[PDB]
Design a protein around this ligand. Structure first.
Ligand SMILES: O=C1Nc2ccccc2/C1=C1/Nc2ccccc2/C1=N\O
Length: 273
């Protein structure tokens, strides 16, 4: 029994160390452990139905973050749906993903590590978690899968940009349709090649600012054409394709914002609540 500042707090469900827990009255979750204090300050700034809420903290000579409980993550939903999800659902999950991320961006914060397991869903409704690598606007930055990273980041971009999360939302959007990860580079060095092998290699003519990126000067890349959206995501509705393509364009200045994406005609039929 560990004393928080709000309450006293039990199965083991952890990784990477997360437990399940009982309040003196409600079910919570306990994340055990630098990037933790960060996570508190950032999470206090982020109160939103689509961001997993932090309810308490326990300090011992190990930090424990007390969170609202969440049945599962999207990593697990994709294992029950190996060929993708129902169009009704993709729309729902995607929309909530955009709503959480939009809230972050309005509040000058970037998740920077969006991926299915960092998206928790409760049995009712999906929420962003794990702000360990989040970037507050103006504060300097201080293992992982590279499958959802923006190509420009992978190429050495250091600049603050909301576009970085939209790339990740794109890869997740695509993953929900096929059931499979869009850019599963076999090693870390294969990630950019993998990306280009599907979306085509970017060219300086259309996107003049690759040339200014640190890994573009230090490396040449095999030149691919884009694979038609027809073979990447067979049979998906045109509206969806349009949206995904606007999430996945190479030029961070052309890439759609979370808020704009919420207004896309693909979301014509969904209740915005
Ligand atoms: O309910 C939760 N709220 C969280 C907030 C932050 C991180 C995790 C969780 C979390 C988790 N719930 C789970 C249920 C089964 C297996 C793992 C987790 C888990 N995490 O592994």
């Amino acid at each position: 029994y560990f004393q928080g500042l709000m309450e006293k707090y039990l199965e083991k469900v952890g990784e990477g160390v997360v437990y399940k827990a009982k309040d003196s009255q409600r079910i919570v979750a306990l994340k055990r452990i630098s990037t933790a204090i960060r996570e508190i300050s950032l999470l206090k700034e982020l109160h939103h139905p689509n961001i997993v809420s932090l309810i308490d903290v326990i300090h011992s000579e190990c930090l424990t973050l007390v969170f609202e409980f969440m049945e599962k993550d999207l990593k697990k939903v994709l294992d029950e749906n190996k060929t993708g999800l129902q169009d009704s659902q993709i729309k729902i999950y995607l929309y909530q993903l955009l709503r959480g991320v939009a809230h972050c961006h309005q509040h000058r914060i970037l998740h920077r590590d969006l991926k299915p397991q960092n998206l928790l869903i409760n049995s009712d409704a999906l929420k962003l978690a794990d702000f360990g690598l989040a970037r507050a606007f103006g504060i300097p930055v201080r293992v992982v899968t590279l499958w959802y990273r923006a190509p420009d980041v992978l190429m050495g971009s250091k600049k603050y940009s909301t576009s970085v999360d939209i790339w990740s939302i794109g890869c997740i959007f695509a993953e929900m349709i096929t059931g499979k990860p869009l850019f599963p580079g076999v090693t870390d060095d294969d990630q950019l090649p993998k990306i280009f092998s599907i979306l085509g290699t970017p060219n300086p003519r259309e996107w003049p600012q690759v040339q200014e990126l640190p890994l573009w000067k230090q490396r040449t890349f095999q030149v691919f054409e884009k694979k038609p959206w027809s073979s990447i995501i067979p049979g998906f509705c045109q509206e969806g394709i349009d949206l995904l393509s606007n999430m996945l364009c190479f030029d961070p200045n052309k890439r759609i914002s979370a808020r704009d994406a919420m207004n896309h005609p693909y979301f014509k039929d969904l209740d915005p609540q």
